[PDB]
Write a protein that binds this ligand. Sequence first.
Ligand code: HEM
Ligand SMILES: CC1=C(/C=C/C(C)=C/C=C/C(C)=C/C(=O)O)C(C)(C)CCC1
Length: 435
Amino acid sequence: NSLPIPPGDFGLPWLGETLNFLNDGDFGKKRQQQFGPIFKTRLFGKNVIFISGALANRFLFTKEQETFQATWPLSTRILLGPNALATQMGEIHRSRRKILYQAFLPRTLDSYLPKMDGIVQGYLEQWGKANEVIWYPQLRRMTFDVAATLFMGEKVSQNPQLFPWFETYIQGLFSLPIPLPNTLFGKSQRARALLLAELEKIIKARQQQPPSEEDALGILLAARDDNNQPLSLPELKDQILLLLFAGHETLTSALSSFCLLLGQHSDIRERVRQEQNKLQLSQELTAETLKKMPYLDQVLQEVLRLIPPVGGGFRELIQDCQFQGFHFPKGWLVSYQISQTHADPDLYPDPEKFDPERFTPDGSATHNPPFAHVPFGGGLRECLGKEFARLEMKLFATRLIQQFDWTLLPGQNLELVVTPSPRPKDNLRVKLHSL
Ligand code: HEM
Ligand SMILES: CC1=C(/C=C/C(C)=C/C=C/C(C)=C/C(=O)O)C(C)(C)CCC1
């Protein structure tokens, strides 16, 4: 069939519009205005079509196996490793998906709580003592601490080079894949080498011990493929590195967003508080207690809606396709943009406004088309850790609101940069007031 390809500029050979993608907060919106709802570009040497909205998301998460193959930018793939779920395909992917899910079972999450709440309260106490808190970097310390603790173990967490290395590793994930020591990418390459060497040490320690499936690392050590074979060491290291990155980076964004938004909407903050008051907290807080928070549930859906931690995903077309009148050529990439979908005014009337009532029983977002709220993606690659994320968001939201009000200091830049997750430019300057 003789259909046109989408409008859009490819730019220079290979380089294309990669620099705009990596540096402009404007990328998708600029090309939507200039080119329309479906546009093409070139990124990291690949021709890419950007799509968004319920129907485009439906398309991308339908008859997927025969059409769409998950991928990531060249820098991301190299730094994740060939043995990570994010970089696995087909039968291997299906298998590790079932293996990893066991780390996030309803009851295993329930068992994460005590250590998680202990790490959470520890930080709140410190921040409550301070005058001004520059919050964003603090949230990064905390979320790493929770992830290292719950996925690996407590003595692992107090060990002191791990965080600095991860921070450097993260900075190169979405960058120019230039393998020199004076680039963000080469520094992340070196960070990855140092981290794997440590995780290898951490793994060899755990193997000379009675089998425990308390955490993610123990779960992976116990895991067997369909041919009853263990995961290799290189796979073990790539898999924990991913879980620690995802558990750390995404949650840093979600919680700064929550602190940002409930910072600016003190009425919503009070309704959350009113909810946790019709219960009975103390320090006594169980997994079944957090399941009694329907209104907080709504706020957290809406935080993720307004400021999605993960901007989008990428797929290679392995079949030739068409969508809304365009040829989607075999071997080109498609990118689904969660940020664009969540800013659709048809899906989200007054998209710029923070309104939890969209997720209230009969609200606008409840009878939207499928694939309208996609903070965790959908189809075959839908976030595997979503309930770990929701757990940590709910506990943090709960402990923070029960103990403190807070003020976002006047004259700061609250504007959001994405390297590679939304963060406020001036790192969220606050004062907490104890209750
Ligand atoms: C609110 C926080 C989070 C958000 C918004 C989020 C978002 C996403 C999205 C959009 C995808 C799909 C990307 C694609 O289409 O390929 C994904 C996949 C994934 N997520 Fe999450 N994520 C979050 C937290 C977590 C956590 C806490 C973990 C566990 C440590 C995690 C682990 C993963 C993994 C391993 C994948 C790859 C799945 C696959 O390739 O099949 N994420 N996530
Ligand atoms: C790599 C990777 C992850 C992080 C994705 C991020 C942080 C990308 C943001 C997308 C952007 C920045 C796209 C755009 O703007 O178009 C998650 C946690 C899902 C785990 C699977 C592998």
